[PDB]
Amino acid sequence: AEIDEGVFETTATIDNGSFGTRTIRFETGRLALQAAGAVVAYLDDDNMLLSATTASKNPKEHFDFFPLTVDVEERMYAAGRIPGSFFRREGRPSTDAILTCRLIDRPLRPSFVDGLRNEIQIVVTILSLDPGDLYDVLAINAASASTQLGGLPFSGPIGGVRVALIDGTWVGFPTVDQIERAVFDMVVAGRIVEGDVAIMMVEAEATENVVELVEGGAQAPTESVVAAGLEAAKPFIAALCTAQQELADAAGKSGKPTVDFPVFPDYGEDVYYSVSSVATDELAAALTIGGKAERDQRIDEIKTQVVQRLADTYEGREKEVGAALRALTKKLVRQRILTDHFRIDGRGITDIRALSAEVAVVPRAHGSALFERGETQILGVTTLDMIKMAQQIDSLGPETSKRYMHHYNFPPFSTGETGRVGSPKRREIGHGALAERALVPVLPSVEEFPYAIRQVSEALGSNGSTSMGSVCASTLALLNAGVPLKAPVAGIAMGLVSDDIQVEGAVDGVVERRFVTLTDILGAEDAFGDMDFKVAGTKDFVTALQLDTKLDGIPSQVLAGALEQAKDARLTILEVMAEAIDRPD
Amino acid sequence: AEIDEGVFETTATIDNGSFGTRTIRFETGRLALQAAGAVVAYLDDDNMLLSATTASKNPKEHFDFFPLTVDVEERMYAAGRIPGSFFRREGRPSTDAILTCRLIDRPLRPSFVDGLRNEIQIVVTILSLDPGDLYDVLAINAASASTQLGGLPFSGPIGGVRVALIDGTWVGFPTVDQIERAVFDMVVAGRIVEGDVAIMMVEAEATENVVELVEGGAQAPTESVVAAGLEAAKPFIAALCTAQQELADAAGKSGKPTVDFPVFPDYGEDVYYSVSSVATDELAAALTIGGKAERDQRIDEIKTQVVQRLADTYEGREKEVGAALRALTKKLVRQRILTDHFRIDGRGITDIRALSAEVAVVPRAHGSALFERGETQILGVTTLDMIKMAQQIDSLGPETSKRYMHHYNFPPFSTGETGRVGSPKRREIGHGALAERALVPVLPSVEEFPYAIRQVSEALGSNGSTSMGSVCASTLALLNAGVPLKAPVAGIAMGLVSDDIQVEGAVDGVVERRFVTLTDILGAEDAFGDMDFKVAGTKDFVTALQLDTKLDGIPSQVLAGALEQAKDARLTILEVMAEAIDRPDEMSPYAPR
Amino acid sequence: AEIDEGVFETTATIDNGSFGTRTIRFETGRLALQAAGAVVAYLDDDNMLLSATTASKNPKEHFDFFPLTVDVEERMYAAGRIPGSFFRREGRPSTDAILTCRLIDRPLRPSFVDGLRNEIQIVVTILSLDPGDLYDVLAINAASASTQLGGLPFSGPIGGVRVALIDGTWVGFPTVDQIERAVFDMVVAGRIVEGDVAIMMVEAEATENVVELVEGGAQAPTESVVAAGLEAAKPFIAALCTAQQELADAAGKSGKPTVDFPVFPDYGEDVYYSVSSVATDELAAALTIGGKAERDQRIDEIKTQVVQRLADTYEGREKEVGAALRALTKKLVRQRILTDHFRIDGRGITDIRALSAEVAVVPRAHGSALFERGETQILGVTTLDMIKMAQQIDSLGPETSKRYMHHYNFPPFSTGETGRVGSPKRREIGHGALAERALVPVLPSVEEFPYAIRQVSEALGSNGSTSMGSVCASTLALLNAGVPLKAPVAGIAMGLVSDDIQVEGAVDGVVERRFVTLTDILGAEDAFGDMDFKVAGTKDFVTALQLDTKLDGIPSQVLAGALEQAKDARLTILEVMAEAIDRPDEMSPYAPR
RNA sequence: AAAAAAAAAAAAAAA
Ligand SMILES: O=C(NC1(C(=O)O)CCCC1)c1ccc(-c2ccc(NC(=O)c3nc(-c4ccccc4)oc3C(F)(F)F)cc2)cc1
Ligand SMILES: O=C(NC1(C(=O)O)CCCC1)c1ccc(-c2ccc(NC(=O)c3nc(-c4ccccc4)oc3C(F)(F)F)cc2)cc1
Ligand SMILES: O=C(NC1(C(=O)O)CCCC1)c1ccc(-c2ccc(NC(=O)c3nc(-c4ccccc4)oc3C(F)(F)F)cc2)cc1
């Protein structure tokens, strides 16, 4: 809709029945005209933000990864007050801004074509905010829209939404007041594939009032309820994607990429063919070696031997042969899993690594615990203080104080490396937040337990799924310190490997798609797998959920099976945790 | 004067008649003897500071620019107080220190010979400060003197001064009490050329009491008054330069530089000759397109073809080819302007770009505005709060609190680039301060309007003179929020192109300097021009002023014409702004009372 | 002892007679199993910490030094409370953490084989702390143990201990309450060589109550008392080293280094041989030049000549020839000192450089002073304020407030360099701490002098031992401000060069080892010397001491002589600076009352 | 981390 000369606008409607209806408006052609693409987004003519996308002129090939940057700028005048810091100006980004950056980055990063090396930056500035609303999902939609309008090698629009479960109804774009009446809150992002919605990213939690609401007659959030919520999110995502596509079509764009960006593939076809022909049997034999150290040294000497010949023939190109060896090893591992259902460490597909839990490991600490799963080792420590030591928060969001604080540390020596020790990175902030929200729903009220609580997790050894280990360790340490939890909580990380491998028959035209679900995946299995998701909760319902995928469709039965498998593992871990301690000390 | 063996001293006198006399003393040969040059500067026996200059042993020829760095270190013991921070120690530099660094850097940077690639650093430490005095101009003088004594490829001494207009007299080096009785105060820096003072840098503002003083019978600071003030600062600059030169002569130095520094020109002469002979006609034709996208595409194609062919011929030397192409383009643009009075975008020499102004653009904002000039686009937002949210200042200078705050932001996408988004840089601080001082003299008193005020400017699009756009946007947004200003304010930027071109005749000896003044310059005209002169004010008098120039002298009539043209442009912009809003609105329901 | 499958532990006992006995326990095989080495250390089953050591897979040859890194992580839950900062989380390291990092780094860094280029990182995390205990020395032991256990090219275990002098007994690992009754406190680190303890690192101070304790009848800490304290620490170090070695043997390791680390020597044998054969006599004569400027000019001429001669022959290698020339020049200077007792500047073995002291240099400062020793030049400034301006400290240690603060600044221009100016480095923190502790024992009580005191030292020129110069300047400036000190304090830096050379005779296999002690060493002498130590105090006893060495044994007579020589120099300097001021002045009118 | 050796329009990961 051309409201003005050069200005275009589109609208999408979210109908929540008796809970109301909301409108989202996208506008382009008026602000920030020197960027590659720019969009202004409105929610209910009271929430307003701007998103701009640009790209660098020259490729940059000293890097070996795709350089993408996302930034969120929260302006205090959007809340109508002056910043409280000593210099009266906005400083480093807050935790909410970092979490929003991660939410945008996770689904968009894999949507670009492989091998790109130009810098790409997305900046989202918050301009106006209603006190009872949340801006993160709106920001996701705006970032997608500006990237789409920028004429870059980007795979279609991406839509994001939040759904909350209130009195048996899934409500889209709920307010803070409505969230206070819900039992479960979930952010979902996806895209449209051949007329159907494919889920890409999920982040969900249980609310802080869930136990009381369930005692009043509400339905608890079990696995089937979560699946139903995922199904209910799809129509909203479809509507948002349609609005973005209409905006792109109206303001030209569509085709005519004009500027063409080069691509830098990891390796050439001939190098890969030679590497396969020379090392297929060596790698196949090596992967059958039980143990860790001997297998690692066998693989290392295979690498040094193979690179000693092909590099000389291919005129001093060792990175290409290394990449080809990585690709061949990954393919072999996937094929072995798909055919024999045999994992690299020898486990079955439903097996968990060796578990152990212990309490009272730091002499003067108020509470402490040590939790081990395979080579993953987490130490948790809890301290208690007067209620005045709760954190005071000054930001755009509605939160003003923080009674329970959780901090997560990941030192380089946990993986045998060296590196800078200093401020936490974005990934540490994200992992800490996930564990914190996993624990929030099981906590006594201020009236019955008037203390400020700080929990610290330190990853002393890491081989995959450190967040779930921190969840378990925090439950153990809180019990050891005498906090009266409503119920213990545990978590697990699951993986999925899918492929269209041949089935019983011939002709090679009867291939059917197959899926395999893996319990308690290692780091390598995450790197080589097709989907990974983490589940935490009690023995009655889920408290936290996180999922990332890139497949173009997942049958419902596969997801139901995966959720049930995760629940079984969670119960098995809860039994071992209870053996160490089963009531507050 | 050798007061002690190896120690030399020189003095300069500033005579203000019935307002008093002041003395400035330079000393060398006693402190910091391992630096390349070092000087101690005194003002009235009570203000004392130290300046030191050093240079790196080896060059960095892979750099594309001259790496000069300036640092100002404020010590709290200069005021007899312990720092108030949690660790009781000086931390990151304050806004005053950053502004002083910019003041030193602007005139000194062009004074070095081009092509230099050694690192040069200047550090100024404040040792003792009288509560009623300012140290910035003294610092400019000391930095110049230490660099002059360091035996570097530096062009002559530079002198800097402050002048304030009190009862029709321009007083040099005024105190805080004297400044609060003035209507205008201005900092000027220059050098001596063929026995006359050439002005290089200017920074001026009207005071916060100007309206009340003018109502009481004082003369308002119009254009002619400001020009007279510029003329009155020259004798002081000459005296300061003479004192510095005498100090340099006394302590040896002067000749025999001893250390020789290499130079790295951007391109060779043969490369320039080839580029010219291959591309002159193509470039001349391309500049006639005058339609941006087509012109940009044509220039890019010409550049690609030339670099390809000349890299084939010269075996992979592309940087010099690019530099030569840029220099040739600059020469053609300047010649077109000087001969035919044609600009890049097809404007006359006095024309302003298309203007537009709008208010109430952010829904839950106390006031907001959008201001556009051709391709520069500024968004301004106002917020109001209780008087206790005023900024508390704990610096070395006399200021203790700030009722009105202005912050300026310049994101990378404003010009289509990618870069880091973080803490503001020094240039952002400078632009913000310039826009802030243009509005102070018009704000209402705290008794009438008891609120703290914060203004934010965001440069959504940048193609030249973003600070003047910030001034206009702040006026609009403040009016939209219900602040009762005394008068609206607006601003503009001006440019210059000059050279020695033979007048109609012969003998090649009648060559004389010729000047052309441009209104509302583009970014490219600033890059290829000879100066950048920003003027802001009301319809009655000027409120803020900033100038930097690289030439060796501008005739007074040229500046007078520039000021008059700027005033005409300002009036046009004010009329356009008033058409959009001409009186304060009602206060927003979301604001406090 | 294998308490559990794969878990080993060992114990060391420390017996203080009637003052009690303590135990230190080392454990491995349980925590942090992916690091190269990891150890847990316990003190009295109430203090607990963890240390981990890792190494990078590949070397890096573009560095010209050994990249070792040490980090100390203080966790606030070890004290059982939530951090007090706005974000409720631990931020940048505190001063105590930095000092502990340097205490670990000083003895361990020279203990690795030269030429190593892999990254080595050590991280020590504090897990549990008793309120009346100190964790720094326990951390030193743990870092040594984890490095030893990692199978790296590391020369044997290193032990560290603290001894405090109480009622004539040297107590090991004292508590805070016990230190409150001591006159002297000393941290010592060493290692076992051919069955005897060789001292490597010392850092010592006098307590804040020393004057009153000595008035009460205790013995003052003179030079002989400090020597006795150094002797009393050896058995504890031996026991700690033995426990570490037993732990290493029990858990395998010992042999089988497995991982081989390449080494990158500075120069080859042939390059050194040619450089010597072509430059021996040419450099020998240049060192006889008494003029520093002529000396360095000739030296750089010779370097350029040798470089341009030998670059062609060795296919171009400037770094190797430069390194060989450095080794040759250092060897020649050492031989000259050992044989003729001559120094670079022609001084005698006990001579001090020219001294000068002056007060009242900054006009408005409460007190100020300028101190010069040869080419070293320090400016000191004092500030006084209300007692509420004392620093408030929030950390693990028992300290909670800081009445006297000392800050030390080392700008790049003090050596004629360019560099970043801003937050201080670790070395500045260390030097400031040393000067602060040197002054603490001479200070009036709060009841007698109710003020907060801030002292700032600025190194305007540096050529060697700026920290002792800071001590002298602080005494002068404090007297000038009117602070009633109990006695003045001065300091000096000393060097020692040792070697085994032939004695008058024949056979050439009867060489004997000799030592030469140097007073007030230059920077070059420190670079080319074998040991350096700094001593400060009054005319009656020592207040601070710092020592670093790598020799495998020092006779007691040599050390006694060195201490006496330092005392003589200190008395001479005190006499010189009493001429400038001998009693406190009247308080400045600008200071509060 | 060891050591004396800013000017201009031009973050992802176990690694
Ligand atoms: O700990 C973690 N924690 C995190 C968590 O989730 O919380 C913390 C925050 C996020 C992660 C983590 C730990 C380890 C990994 C990992 C991934 C891949 C490989 N890669 C191989 O391991 C390999 N490389 C080869 C090969 C190499 C060269 C030539 C030929 C082959 O072969 C192989 C072979 F199959 F043998 F196993 C190792 C480790 C990831 C995550
Ligand atoms: O806003 C601005 N600054 C600030 C302000 O507020 O003021 C904002 C924040 C602080 C200050 C600003 C914006 C843009 C510019 C700019 C300048 C020059 C060019 N350069 C060409 O534009 C060009 N380059 C060529 C050429 C190049 C190589 C080879 C051959 C030809 O030709 C040409 C041709 F003349 F055509 F136009 C572009 C943009 C400057 C300032
Ligand atoms: O100021 C200081 N302050 C500090 C303090 O302690 O507080 C502050 C914090 C720690 C230090 C300091 C000042 C100077 C040094 C230093 C060290 C070595 C050399 N090096 C030569 O000095 C030399 N180099 C040559 C030569 C070179 C190349 C080719 C051939 C010859 O010859 C020679 C010859 F020995 F003769 F004198 C110079 C200065 C150290 C510290």
Q: To 10 degrees, what angle do helices B136-149 and B95-108 make?
A: 40
Instruction: Using the structure block, give the residue that is written with the tokens 């031997």.
Output: A305
- Compute how many other C-beta atoms are within 10 angstroms of the C-beta atom of residue A105: 15
- CA dist B1 → B7, B53, B243 (Å): 8, 23, 12
Measured between alpha carbons, how far is A2 from A30 in angstroms, rounded to an integer?
12
Structure tokens at B194: 């063929």
| CB-CB under 8 Å, C460 with B128 | no
> Residue C567: is it exposed, middle or buried by C-beta count within 10 angstroms (0-12/13-18/19+)?
middle
Q: What is the secondary structure of A402-417 as a DSSP string?
A: ESEEEEEE--GGGGT-
| CB-CB under 8 Å, C32 with A461 | yes
Measured between alpha carbons, how far is C581 from C369 in angstroms, rounded to an integer?
11
Where are the alpha helices (H) located in B266-352, listed in sequence order?
269-286, 293-314, 318-340
Measured between alpha carbons, how far is C426 from B85 in angstroms, rounded to an integer?
20
Contact present, B188 and B170 (Cβ < 8 Å) = no
SS3 label, residue B263: coil
Round to a whole number and report the distance in Å from the CA of C66 to the C1' of D2. Answer: 8
Residue among C36, C46, C91 whose CB faces A363 most closely: C46
* Dihedral sign, Cα of residue A317, residue A321, residue A327, residue A330: negative
Residues pairing with B496 in the sheet: B517
Test the A interface: residue of B86, B304, B358, B364 with most A CBs within 10 Å: B364
| CB-CB under 8 Å, A413 with C54 | yes
* Dihedral sign, Cα of residue C304, residue C306, residue C309, residue C311: negative
From chain C, pick out residues whose CB is under 8 angstroms from the CB of A460. Answer: 31-32
* Dihedral sign, Cα of residue B310, residue B311, residue B315, residue B318: positive
Number of H helices, E strands in chain A: 13, 21
For atom 40 of ligand 3, the residue with the nearest CA is C523
Measured between alpha carbons, how far is B12 from B239 in angstroms, rounded to an integer?
6
* Dihedral sign, Cα of residue B210, residue B215, residue B216, residue B219: positive
**CA nearest C591 in B: which residue?**
B80
Domain(s) labelled CATH 3.30.230.70 in chain C stretch across 8-163+234-250, 355-485
For atom 18 of ligand 2, the residue with the nearest CA is B524
Q: Which residues of C60-88 are buried (b: 16+ CB within 10 A; e: fewer)?
A: eeeeeebebebbbbbbbbbbebbbeeeeb
Round to a whole number and report the distance in Å from the CA of A119 to the C1' of D12. Answer: 13
Q: What is the secondary structure of C279-305 as a DSSP string?
A: HHHHHHHHTT---HHHHHHHHHHHHHH
Residues pairing with B185 in the sheet: B164, B205
CATH superfamily of A8-250: GHMP Kinase, N-terminal domain (3.30.230.70)
Is the minimum distance from the CB of C425 to strand D below 7 Å?
yes
For C356, how many CA atoms within 13 A lie in the half-sphere containing its CB?
10
SS3 label, residue C201: strand
> Residue B68: is it exposed, middle or buried by C-beta count within 10 angstroms (0-12/13-18/19+)?
middle
Taking 3-state DSSP, the helix, strand and coil percentages for chain A, each rounded to the nearest 5, stand at 35, 25, 40
Closest CA to C197 of C584, C569, C570, C549: C549
Structure tokens at C64: 């010209």
- CA dist A66 → A138, A264, A266, A326, C539 (Å): 25, 10, 12, 18, 68
Residue among B363, B416, B418 whose CB faces A34 most closely: B416
Rg over CA atoms, chain B: 25
Residues pairing with A73 in the sheet: A125
Residue C376: its H or E element: strand C376-385
Contact present, B383 and B365 (Cβ < 8 Å) = yes
Contact present, B42 and B104 (Cβ < 8 Å) = no
Q: State which fold the C269-340 domain adopts.
A: Arc Repressor Mutant, subunit A (1.10.10)
> Residue C556: is it exposed, middle or buried by C-beta count within 10 angstroms (0-12/13-18/19+)?
exposed
Structure tokens at B78: 């200069």
Is the minimum distance from the CB of C415 to strand D below 7 Å?
yes
Structure tokens at C460: 């305007």
Residues pairing with A401 in the sheet: A392
Closest CA to A27 of A97, A127, A110, A107: A127
Nearest protein residue to nucleotide D11 (CA to C1' distance) is A69
Measured between alpha carbons, how far is A301 from A278 in angstroms, rounded to an integer?
14
Query: Nearest nt to A410, CA vs C1'?
Result: D14
Query: Nearest nt to C410, CA vs C1'?
Result: D4
Nearest protein residue to nucleotide D3 (CA to C1' distance) is C65
The phi, psi pair for C252, rounded to 5°, reads 60, -135
> In this complex, is the C-beta atom of C406 within 8 Å of any C-beta atom belonging to chain B?
no
- CA dist A284 → A279, A280, A281, A344, B272 (Å): 8, 6, 5, 11, 62
Residue B321: CB partners within 8 Å, gap ≥ 6? B267, B271, B275, B306, B307, B310, B311, B314
> Residue C222: is it exposed, middle or buried by C-beta count within 10 angstroms (0-12/13-18/19+)?
middle
Measured between alpha carbons, how far is A486 from C155 in angstroms, rounded to an integer?
55
Measured between alpha carbons, how far is C67 from C60 in angstroms, rounded to an integer?
10
Domain(s) labelled CATH 3.30.230.70 in chain A stretch across 8-250, 355-580
Contact present, A328 and A276 (Cβ < 8 Å) = yes
Residue B55: its H or E element: strand B47-55
Structure tokens at A224: 């089937």
- Compute how many other C-beta atoms are within 10 angstroms of the C-beta atom of residue C339: 10
Query: Which ligand has an atom closest to residue B532 CA?
Result: 2
The phi, psi pair for B7, rounded to 5°, reads -110, 130
Round to a whole number and report the distance in Å from the CA of A160 to the C1' of D9. Answer: 36
Residue C155: CB partners within 8 Å, gap ≥ 6? C111, C112, C113, C191
> Residue B338: is it exposed, middle or buried by C-beta count within 10 angstroms (0-12/13-18/19+)?
middle
Contact present, B468 and B492 (Cβ < 8 Å) = yes
Query: Nearest nt to A109, CA vs C1'?
Result: D12
> In this complex, is the C-beta atom of B30 within 8 Å of any C-beta atom belonging to chain C?
no
| CB-CB under 8 Å, B365 with A80 | yes
Is the minimum distance from the CB of A67 to strand D below 7 Å?
yes
Chain A segment 416-455 residues within 8 A of B by beta carbon are: none
Measured between alpha carbons, how far is A159 from A172 in angstroms, rounded to an integer?
13
Measured between alpha carbons, how far is B291 from B301 in angstroms, rounded to an integer?
16
Q: What angle do CA A267, A271, A272 make, to 5 degrees?
A: 75
Q: To 10 degrees, what angle do helices B426-439 and B95-108 make?
A: 100
Taking 3-state DSSP, the helix, strand and coil percentages for chain B, each rounded to the nearest 5, stand at 35, 25, 40
**CA nearest B33 in C: which residue?**
C461
Range B355-580 has CATH code 3.40.50.150: no
Q: Which residues of A140-166 are buried (b: 16+ CB within 10 A; e: fewer)?
A: bbbbbbbbbbbbbebeebbbbbbbbbb
**Alpha carbon A238 to chain centroid distance?**
21
Residues pairing with B370 in the sheet: B358, B379
SS3 label, residue C47: strand
Using the 8-state DSSP alphabet, how is residue C116 labeled? B
The phi, psi pair for A23, rounded to 5°, reads -130, 140
Contact present, C379 and C368 (Cβ < 8 Å) = yes
The phi, psi pair for A391, rounded to 5°, reads -70, 140
- Compute how many other C-beta atoms are within 10 angstroms of the C-beta atom of residue A106: 18
Spacing, Cα B385 to ligand 1 middle (Å): 54
For atom 30 of ligand 2, the residue with the nearest CA is B326
> Residue A56: is it exposed, middle or buried by C-beta count within 10 angstroms (0-12/13-18/19+)?
middle
Residues with CB under 6 A from ligand 3: C 299, 303, 325-326, 329, 333, 344, 427, 462-467, 523-524, 527
Contact present, B101 and B426 (Cβ < 8 Å) = yes
Q: Is C582 annotated as a binding residue?
A: no
Residue B307: CB partners within 8 Å, gap ≥ 6? B318, B321, B322, B325
Measured between alpha carbons, how far is B425 from B432 in angstroms, rounded to an integer?
11
Output C286-291 pairs: Cβ under 8 A, ≥24 positions apart: C287/C332, C287/C333, C287/C336, C287/C344, C290/C345, C290/C346
- CA dist C328 → A344, B162, C315, C324, C332 (Å): 59, 58, 22, 6, 6
Residues pairing with A378 in the sheet: A371, A459
Number of H helices, E strands in chain B: 13, 21
Measured between alpha carbons, how far is B55 from C416 in angstroms, rounded to an integer?
8
Query: Which ligand has an atom closest to residue C532 CA?
Result: 3
Is the minimum distance from the CB of A60 to strand D below 7 Å?
no
Largest CA distance in chain C: 77
| CB-CB under 8 Å, C418 with B129 | no
Structure tokens at B157: 């001494």
Four-point Cα dihedral C104, C105, C106, C107, nearest 10 = 60
Contact present, B376 and B467 (Cβ < 8 Å) = no
From chain C, pick out residues whose CB is under 8 angstroms from the CB of A375. Answer: 33-34
State the amino acid at position B29 in one-letter form: G
Contact present, A138 and A43 (Cβ < 8 Å) = yes
Residue C193: its H or E element: strand C184-193
Query: Which ligand has an atom closest to residue B327 CA?
Result: 2
* Dihedral sign, Cα of residue B275, residue B278, residue B280, residue B283: negative
**CA nearest A387 in C: which residue?**
C82
Experimental method, per PDB record = cryo-EM
Is the minimum distance from the CB of B523 to strand D below 7 Å?
yes
Instruction: Using the structure block, give the residue that is written with the tokens 């400017």.
Output: B457
- Compute how many other C-beta atoms are within 10 angstroms of the C-beta atom of residue C338: 15
Is the minimum distance from the CB of A303 to strand D below 7 Å?
no
Measured between alpha carbons, how far is A566 from A206 in angstroms, rounded to an integer?
17
Round to a whole number and report the distance in Å from the CA of A85 to the C1' of D7. Answer: 30
Instruction: Using the structure block, give the residue that is written with the tokens 């210059």.
Output: B496
Q: What is the secondary structure of B391-405 as a DSSP string?
A: EE--SSSS--EESEE
Indicate the CATH number for domain C355-485: 3.30.230.70
- CA dist C314 → C167, C271, C304, C305, C357 (Å): 66, 8, 15, 15, 52
Structure tokens at C104: 């670990």
Output C524-528 pairs: Cβ under 8 A, ≥24 positions apart: C524/C333, C524/C344, C525/C343, C525/C344, C525/C464, C525/C495, C526/C464, C526/C493, C526/C495, C527/C330, C528/C330, C528/C333, C528/C334, C528/C497
State the amino acid at position C74 in one-letter form: E
From chain C, pick out residues whose CB is under 8 angstroms from the CB of A417. Answer: 54, 56
Residue A237: CB partners within 8 Å, gap ≥ 6? A159, A160, A161, A188, A189, A190, A191, A192, A197
> Residue C313: is it exposed, middle or buried by C-beta count within 10 angstroms (0-12/13-18/19+)?
exposed
Instruction: Using the structure block, give the residue that is written with the tokens 């240690």.
Output: C397
β-bridge pairing A159-166 and A120-128:
unpaired
Closest CA to B162 of B146, B179, B180, B183: B179
For B451, how many CA atoms within 13 A lie in the half-sphere containing its CB?
22
Structure tokens at B310: 């000349």
Interface partners of chain B (CB pairs < 8 Å, 3 or more) are A, C
Measured between alpha carbons, how far is B172 from B234 in angstroms, rounded to an integer?
11
β-bridge pairing A531-537 and A514-519:
unpaired
Range C8-163+234-250 has CATH code 3.30.70.20: no
- Compute how many other C-beta atoms are within 10 angstroms of the C-beta atom of residue B323: 18
Round to a whole number and report the distance in Å from the CA of A419 to the C1' of D12. Answer: 16
Contact present, C30 and C40 (Cβ < 8 Å) = yes
The phi, psi pair for A501, rounded to 5°, reads -75, 155
Contact present, A189 and A107 (Cβ < 8 Å) = yes
Residue A387: CB partners within 8 Å, gap ≥ 6? A403, A446, A450, A451, A452
Spacing, Cα B474 to ligand 2 middle (Å): 26
Q: What angle do CA A392, A398, A399 make, to 5 degrees?
A: 30
Domain(s) labelled CATH 1.10.10.400 in chain C stretch across 269-340
**Alpha carbon B48 to chain centroid distance?**
26
Query: Which ligand has an atom closest to residue C295 CA?
Result: 3
Residues pairing with C68 in the sheet: C120
- CA dist A202 → A81, A185, A515 (Å): 34, 11, 20
Measured between alpha carbons, how far is A581 from A484 in angstroms, rounded to an integer?
13
Task: Give chain D positions with protein CB within 7 A.
Answer: 1-15
Measured between alpha carbons, how far is C377 from C357 in angstroms, rounded to an integer?
10
